Amino acid sequence: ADGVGSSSGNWHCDSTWLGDRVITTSTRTWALPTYNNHLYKQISNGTSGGSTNDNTYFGYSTPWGYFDFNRFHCHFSPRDWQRLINNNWGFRPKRLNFKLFNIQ
Amino acid sequence: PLMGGFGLKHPPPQILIKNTPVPADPPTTFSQAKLASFITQYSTGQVSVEIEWELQKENSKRWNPEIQYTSNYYKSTNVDFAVNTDGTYSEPRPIGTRYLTRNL
């Protein structure tokens, strides 16, 4: 089984163009700091300062971080993008799969 | 072939066609000479040729975009590879087959 000395997964970046399906996998290396010294904090901006009435807000800044893969170039190489946009009329996602591994 | 092409030992068999000669009226008295007077005649029709091809799909990990054959984006007096005002079809430029890349 898993332990301190055996890796949790393998690196995958690739694109499988099969018929009408293209399956794009990707992998990156990240670093997650300690935000707010483990604190939730109220944050706000009022119009009593230099800010104007349109720029006011009220909310909270949590210690948690989050993964955002929501841009296309995260998932496509410029050559895989060229195969897509040149040869096909339309495309839509079907399903995704997500993994964290190799945690230091 | 030095012009470029597929050298074949048994190439596609050449197809020959002719109008069967139809004689004009022979004389009423026998003659040994061959019949030198024919009916002026020609034929027309429809021909179809269908070739199946075998493709070698491009599989490459090149990151950046390829070079593709693209028509001129800018405006023009008439479309390329299309009829002009008078109905004359035209092909503006020779188009080679090598835009993809491989590693030597």
Side-chain angles (χ1 to χ4, degrees), chain A residues 44-73:
Chain A
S44 67
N45 190 28
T47 187
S48 178
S51 178
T52 187
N53 189 31
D54 295 345
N55 292 334
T56 60
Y57 64 92
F58 179 89
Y60 296 99
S61 65
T62 65
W64 293 78
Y66 68 96
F67 293 100
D68 189 11
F69 46 90
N70 198 29
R71 299 179 71 180
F72 285 101
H73 61 60

mmCIF file of all heavy atoms in Angstrom, chain A residues 44-73:
data_model
loop_
_atom_site.group_PDB
_atom_site.id
_atom_site.type_symbol
_atom_site.label_atom_id
_atom_site.label_comp_id
_atom_site.label_asym_id
_atom_site.label_seq_id
_atom_site.Cartn_x
_atom_site.Cartn_y
_atom_site.Cartn_z
ATOM 1 N N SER A 44 -13.853 44.602 3.792
ATOM 2 C CA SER A 44 -14.863 45.518 3.293
ATOM 3 C C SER A 44 -14.173 46.741 2.720
ATOM 4 O O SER A 44 -13.011 47.015 3.019
ATOM 5 C CB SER A 44 -15.831 45.940 4.395
ATOM 6 O OG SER A 44 -15.165 46.718 5.368
ATOM 7 N N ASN A 45 -14.908 47.469 1.889
ATOM 8 C CA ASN A 45 -14.471 48.772 1.415
ATOM 9 C C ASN A 45 -15.670 49.695 1.386
ATOM 10 O O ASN A 45 -16.690 49.363 0.784
ATOM 11 C CB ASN A 45 -13.844 48.680 0.031
ATOM 12 C CG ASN A 45 -13.180 49.956 -0.389
ATOM 13 O OD1 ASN A 45 -12.716 50.731 0.444
ATOM 14 N ND2 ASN A 45 -13.114 50.181 -1.694
ATOM 15 N N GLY A 46 -15.549 50.842 2.047
ATOM 16 C CA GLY A 46 -16.613 51.815 2.111
ATOM 17 C C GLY A 46 -16.334 53.022 1.234
ATOM 18 O O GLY A 46 -15.245 53.209 0.699
ATOM 19 N N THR A 47 -17.361 53.851 1.100
ATOM 20 C CA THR A 47 -17.239 55.130 0.420
ATOM 21 C C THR A 47 -16.742 56.234 1.341
ATOM 22 O O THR A 47 -16.549 57.365 0.882
ATOM 23 C CB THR A 47 -18.581 55.535 -0.188
ATOM 24 O OG1 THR A 47 -18.407 56.706 -0.992
ATOM 25 C CG2 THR A 47 -19.589 55.823 0.908
ATOM 26 N N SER A 48 -16.537 55.939 2.626
ATOM 27 C CA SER A 48 -15.994 56.944 3.532
ATOM 28 C C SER A 48 -14.523 57.212 3.253
ATOM 29 O O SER A 48 -14.002 58.262 3.644
ATOM 30 C CB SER A 48 -16.182 56.509 4.982
ATOM 31 O OG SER A 48 -15.616 57.459 5.869
ATOM 32 N N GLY A 49 -13.840 56.282 2.597
ATOM 33 C CA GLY A 49 -12.462 56.479 2.205
ATOM 34 C C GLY A 49 -12.371 57.183 0.870
ATOM 35 O O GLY A 49 -13.257 57.944 0.471
ATOM 36 N N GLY A 50 -11.268 56.926 0.166
ATOM 37 C CA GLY A 50 -11.131 57.437 -1.186
ATOM 38 C C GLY A 50 -11.983 56.706 -2.201
ATOM 39 O O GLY A 50 -12.179 57.213 -3.310
ATOM 40 N N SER A 51 -12.498 55.533 -1.843
ATOM 41 C CA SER A 51 -13.300 54.743 -2.762
ATOM 42 C C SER A 51 -14.610 55.450 -3.088
ATOM 43 O O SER A 51 -15.100 56.287 -2.325
ATOM 44 C CB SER A 51 -13.586 53.367 -2.167
ATOM 45 O OG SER A 51 -14.412 52.602 -3.023
ATOM 46 N N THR A 52 -15.176 55.104 -4.241
ATOM 47 C CA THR A 52 -16.454 55.647 -4.661
ATOM 48 C C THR A 52 -17.575 54.674 -4.312
ATOM 49 O O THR A 52 -17.346 53.578 -3.797
ATOM 50 C CB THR A 52 -16.444 55.947 -6.156
ATOM 51 O OG1 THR A 52 -17.651 56.633 -6.506
ATOM 52 C CG2 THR A 52 -16.355 54.662 -6.952
ATOM 53 N N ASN A 53 -18.809 55.072 -4.611
ATOM 54 C CA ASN A 53 -19.955 54.261 -4.228
ATOM 55 C C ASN A 53 -20.055 52.973 -5.027
ATOM 56 O O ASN A 53 -20.643 52.003 -4.540
ATOM 57 C CB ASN A 53 -21.246 55.056 -4.389
ATOM 58 C CG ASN A 53 -22.441 54.337 -3.808
ATOM 59 O OD1 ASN A 53 -22.316 53.589 -2.840
ATOM 60 N ND2 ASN A 53 -23.605 54.546 -4.404
ATOM 61 N N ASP A 54 -19.509 52.936 -6.236
ATOM 62 C CA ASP A 54 -19.605 51.732 -7.045
ATOM 63 C C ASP A 54 -18.648 50.649 -6.581
ATOM 64 O O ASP A 54 -18.897 49.467 -6.833
ATOM 65 C CB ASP A 54 -19.322 52.062 -8.508
ATOM 66 C CG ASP A 54 -20.368 52.972 -9.113
ATOM 67 O OD1 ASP A 54 -21.450 53.125 -8.509
ATOM 68 O OD2 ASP A 54 -20.110 53.537 -10.197
ATOM 69 N N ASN A 55 -17.567 51.027 -5.912
ATOM 70 C CA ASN A 55 -16.481 50.123 -5.580
ATOM 71 C C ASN A 55 -16.586 49.546 -4.175
ATOM 72 O O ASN A 55 -15.660 48.865 -3.731
ATOM 73 C CB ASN A 55 -15.151 50.846 -5.753
ATOM 74 C CG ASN A 55 -14.860 51.167 -7.196
ATOM 75 O OD1 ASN A 55 -15.339 50.491 -8.100
ATOM 76 N ND2 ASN A 55 -14.087 52.215 -7.420
ATOM 77 N N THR A 56 -17.667 49.825 -3.456
ATOM 78 C CA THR A 56 -17.832 49.288 -2.116
ATOM 79 C C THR A 56 -18.132 47.797 -2.161
ATOM 80 O O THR A 56 -18.710 47.289 -3.121
ATOM 81 C CB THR A 56 -18.961 50.002 -1.387
ATOM 82 O OG1 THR A 56 -20.179 49.816 -2.113
ATOM 83 C CG2 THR A 56 -18.666 51.474 -1.289
ATOM 84 N N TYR A 57 -17.737 47.094 -1.104
ATOM 85 C CA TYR A 57 -18.018 45.671 -0.997
ATOM 86 C C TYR A 57 -17.974 45.264 0.464
ATOM 87 O O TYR A 57 -17.504 46.009 1.322
ATOM 88 C CB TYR A 57 -17.039 44.840 -1.824
ATOM 89 C CG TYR A 57 -15.592 44.901 -1.390
ATOM 90 C CD1 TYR A 57 -15.079 43.988 -0.492
ATOM 91 C CD2 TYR A 57 -14.739 45.860 -1.890
ATOM 92 C CE1 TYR A 57 -13.768 44.035 -0.112
ATOM 93 C CE2 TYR A 57 -13.429 45.902 -1.527
ATOM 94 C CZ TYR A 57 -12.950 45.000 -0.630
ATOM 95 O OH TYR A 57 -11.632 45.060 -0.257
ATOM 96 N N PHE A 58 -18.510 44.080 0.740
ATOM 97 C CA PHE A 58 -18.385 43.457 2.048
ATOM 98 C C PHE A 58 -18.289 41.957 1.852
ATOM 99 O O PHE A 58 -19.090 41.382 1.113
ATOM 100 C CB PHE A 58 -19.581 43.786 2.932
ATOM 101 C CG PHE A 58 -19.524 43.157 4.279
ATOM 102 C CD1 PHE A 58 -18.917 43.803 5.323
ATOM 103 C CD2 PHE A 58 -20.053 41.902 4.493
ATOM 104 C CE1 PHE A 58 -18.864 43.225 6.547
ATOM 105 C CE2 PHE A 58 -19.987 41.321 5.721
ATOM 106 C CZ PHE A 58 -19.393 41.983 6.747
ATOM 107 N N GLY A 59 -17.349 41.321 2.536
ATOM 108 C CA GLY A 59 -17.193 39.888 2.389
ATOM 109 C C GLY A 59 -16.135 39.357 3.323
ATOM 110 O O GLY A 59 -15.664 40.057 4.218
ATOM 111 N N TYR A 60 -15.757 38.104 3.092
ATOM 112 C CA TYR A 60 -14.799 37.413 3.938
ATOM 113 C C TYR A 60 -13.690 36.797 3.103
ATOM 114 O O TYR A 60 -13.907 36.368 1.970
ATOM 115 C CB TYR A 60 -15.474 36.327 4.760
ATOM 116 C CG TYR A 60 -16.476 36.870 5.727
ATOM 117 C CD1 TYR A 60 -17.821 36.866 5.437
ATOM 118 C CD2 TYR A 60 -16.073 37.380 6.938
ATOM 119 C CE1 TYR A 60 -18.731 37.366 6.325
ATOM 120 C CE2 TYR A 60 -16.974 37.885 7.825
ATOM 121 C CZ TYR A 60 -18.300 37.873 7.520
ATOM 122 O OH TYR A 60 -19.192 38.379 8.428
ATOM 123 N N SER A 61 -12.496 36.751 3.686
ATOM 124 C CA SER A 61 -11.330 36.122 3.081
ATOM 125 C C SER A 61 -10.935 34.928 3.934
ATOM 126 O O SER A 61 -10.458 35.095 5.056
ATOM 127 C CB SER A 61 -10.181 37.111 2.970
ATOM 128 O OG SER A 61 -9.743 37.506 4.248
ATOM 129 N N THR A 62 -11.105 33.758 3.406
ATOM 130 C CA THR A 62 -10.883 32.530 4.139
ATOM 131 C C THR A 62 -9.434 32.089 4.025
ATOM 132 O O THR A 62 -8.719 32.500 3.111
ATOM 133 C CB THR A 62 -11.787 31.439 3.593
ATOM 134 O OG1 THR A 62 -11.401 31.158 2.253
ATOM 135 C CG2 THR A 62 -13.206 31.918 3.564
ATOM 136 N N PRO A 63 -8.956 31.256 4.952
ATOM 137 C CA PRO A 63 -7.621 30.677 4.791
ATOM 138 C C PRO A 63 -7.524 29.659 3.673
ATOM 139 O O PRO A 63 -6.412 29.312 3.271
ATOM 140 C CB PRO A 63 -7.367 30.025 6.146
ATOM 141 C CG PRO A 63 -8.700 29.702 6.625
ATOM 142 C CD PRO A 63 -9.548 30.851 6.231
ATOM 143 N N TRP A 64 -8.640 29.154 3.175
ATOM 144 C CA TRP A 64 -8.620 28.088 2.191
ATOM 145 C C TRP A 64 -8.140 28.596 0.842
ATOM 146 O O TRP A 64 -8.308 29.765 0.501
ATOM 147 C CB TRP A 64 -10.019 27.509 2.067
ATOM 148 C CG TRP A 64 -10.454 26.818 3.291
ATOM 149 C CD1 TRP A 64 -10.907 27.393 4.424
ATOM 150 C CD2 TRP A 64 -10.570 25.418 3.480
ATOM 151 N NE1 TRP A 64 -11.242 26.438 5.338
ATOM 152 C CE2 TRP A 64 -11.049 25.212 4.771
ATOM 153 C CE3 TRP A 64 -10.292 24.316 2.687
ATOM 154 C CZ2 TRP A 64 -11.257 23.958 5.287
ATOM 155 C CZ3 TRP A 64 -10.498 23.077 3.198
ATOM 156 C CH2 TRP A 64 -10.973 22.902 4.483
ATOM 157 N N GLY A 65 -7.511 27.705 0.076
ATOM 158 C CA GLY A 65 -7.186 27.946 -1.310
ATOM 159 C C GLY A 65 -8.070 27.123 -2.232
ATOM 160 O O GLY A 65 -8.854 26.288 -1.803
ATOM 161 N N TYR A 66 -7.914 27.357 -3.531
ATOM 162 C CA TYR A 66 -8.755 26.629 -4.466
ATOM 163 C C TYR A 66 -8.061 26.450 -5.806
ATOM 164 O O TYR A 66 -7.269 27.289 -6.232
ATOM 165 C CB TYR A 66 -10.093 27.332 -4.651
ATOM 166 C CG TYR A 66 -10.041 28.660 -5.360
ATOM 167 C CD1 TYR A 66 -10.289 28.749 -6.712
ATOM 168 C CD2 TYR A 66 -9.757 29.819 -4.678
ATOM 169 C CE1 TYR A 66 -10.258 29.943 -7.355
ATOM 170 C CE2 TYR A 66 -9.723 31.019 -5.318
ATOM 171 C CZ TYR A 66 -9.973 31.075 -6.654
ATOM 172 O OH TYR A 66 -9.936 32.276 -7.307
ATOM 173 N N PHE A 67 -8.379 25.341 -6.465
ATOM 174 C CA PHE A 67 -7.873 25.049 -7.795
ATOM 175 C C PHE A 67 -8.799 25.634 -8.843
ATOM 176 O O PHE A 67 -10.013 25.443 -8.778
ATOM 177 C CB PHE A 67 -7.766 23.548 -8.028
ATOM 178 C CG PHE A 67 -6.736 22.879 -7.199
ATOM 179 C CD1 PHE A 67 -7.087 22.196 -6.065
ATOM 180 C CD2 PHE A 67 -5.416 22.908 -7.574
ATOM 181 C CE1 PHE A 67 -6.133 21.574 -5.314
ATOM 182 C CE2 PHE A 67 -4.472 22.294 -6.828
ATOM 183 C CZ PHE A 67 -4.825 21.625 -5.700
ATOM 184 N N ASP A 68 -8.223 26.311 -9.827
ATOM 185 C CA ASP A 68 -8.984 26.834 -10.951
ATOM 186 C C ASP A 68 -8.322 26.343 -12.230
ATOM 187 O O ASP A 68 -7.212 26.761 -12.556
ATOM 188 C CB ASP A 68 -9.025 28.359 -10.914
ATOM 189 C CG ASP A 68 -9.978 28.935 -11.929
ATOM 190 O OD1 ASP A 68 -10.746 28.149 -12.505
ATOM 191 O OD2 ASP A 68 -9.945 30.158 -12.171
ATOM 192 N N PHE A 69 -8.982 25.430 -12.933
ATOM 193 C CA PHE A 69 -8.569 24.999 -14.259
ATOM 194 C C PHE A 69 -9.411 25.590 -15.388
ATOM 195 O O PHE A 69 -9.413 25.046 -16.492
ATOM 196 C CB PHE A 69 -8.495 23.482 -14.328
ATOM 197 C CG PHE A 69 -9.651 22.786 -13.745
ATOM 198 C CD1 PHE A 69 -10.742 22.481 -14.505
ATOM 199 C CD2 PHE A 69 -9.615 22.376 -12.442
ATOM 200 C CE1 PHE A 69 -11.795 21.808 -13.966
ATOM 201 C CE2 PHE A 69 -10.656 21.703 -11.899
ATOM 202 C CZ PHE A 69 -11.753 21.417 -12.658
ATOM 203 N N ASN A 70 -10.149 26.658 -15.131
ATOM 204 C CA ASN A 70 -11.270 27.090 -15.953
ATOM 205 C C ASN A 70 -10.871 27.798 -17.246
ATOM 206 O O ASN A 70 -11.759 28.284 -17.947
ATOM 207 C CB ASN A 70 -12.174 28.008 -15.136
ATOM 208 C CG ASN A 70 -13.533 28.155 -15.731
ATOM 209 O OD1 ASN A 70 -14.013 27.254 -16.394
ATOM 210 N ND2 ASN A 70 -14.173 29.283 -15.487
ATOM 211 N N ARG A 71 -9.595 27.908 -17.588
ATOM 212 C CA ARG A 71 -9.191 28.476 -18.866
ATOM 213 C C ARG A 71 -8.860 27.366 -19.848
ATOM 214 O O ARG A 71 -8.493 26.261 -19.454
ATOM 215 C CB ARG A 71 -7.988 29.392 -18.713
ATOM 216 C CG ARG A 71 -8.270 30.535 -17.819
ATOM 217 C CD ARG A 71 -7.079 31.422 -17.638
ATOM 218 N NE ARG A 71 -6.754 32.180 -18.830
ATOM 219 C CZ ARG A 71 -5.737 33.022 -18.899
ATOM 220 N NH1 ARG A 71 -4.960 33.204 -17.846
ATOM 221 N NH2 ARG A 71 -5.504 33.695 -20.010
ATOM 222 N N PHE A 72 -9.054 27.647 -21.136
ATOM 223 C CA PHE A 72 -8.799 26.631 -22.155
ATOM 224 C C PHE A 72 -7.336 26.233 -22.229
ATOM 225 O O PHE A 72 -7.029 25.046 -22.345
ATOM 226 C CB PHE A 72 -9.270 27.103 -23.523
ATOM 227 C CG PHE A 72 -10.738 27.060 -23.689
ATOM 228 C CD1 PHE A 72 -11.491 28.194 -23.576
ATOM 229 C CD2 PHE A 72 -11.363 25.869 -23.973
ATOM 230 C CE1 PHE A 72 -12.842 28.142 -23.733
ATOM 231 C CE2 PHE A 72 -12.708 25.807 -24.127
ATOM 232 C CZ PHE A 72 -13.455 26.945 -24.010
ATOM 233 N N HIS A 73 -6.415 27.198 -22.184
ATOM 234 C CA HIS A 73 -5.028 26.826 -22.426
ATOM 235 C C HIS A 73 -4.460 25.968 -21.319
ATOM 236 O O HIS A 73 -3.401 25.368 -21.503
ATOM 237 C CB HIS A 73 -4.123 28.033 -22.628
ATOM 238 C CG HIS A 73 -4.047 28.952 -21.461
ATOM 239 N ND1 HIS A 73 -3.608 28.549 -20.224
ATOM 240 C CD2 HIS A 73 -4.210 30.290 -21.379
ATOM 241 C CE1 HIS A 73 -3.588 29.582 -19.406
ATOM 242 N NE2 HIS A 73 -3.942 30.654 -20.086
#
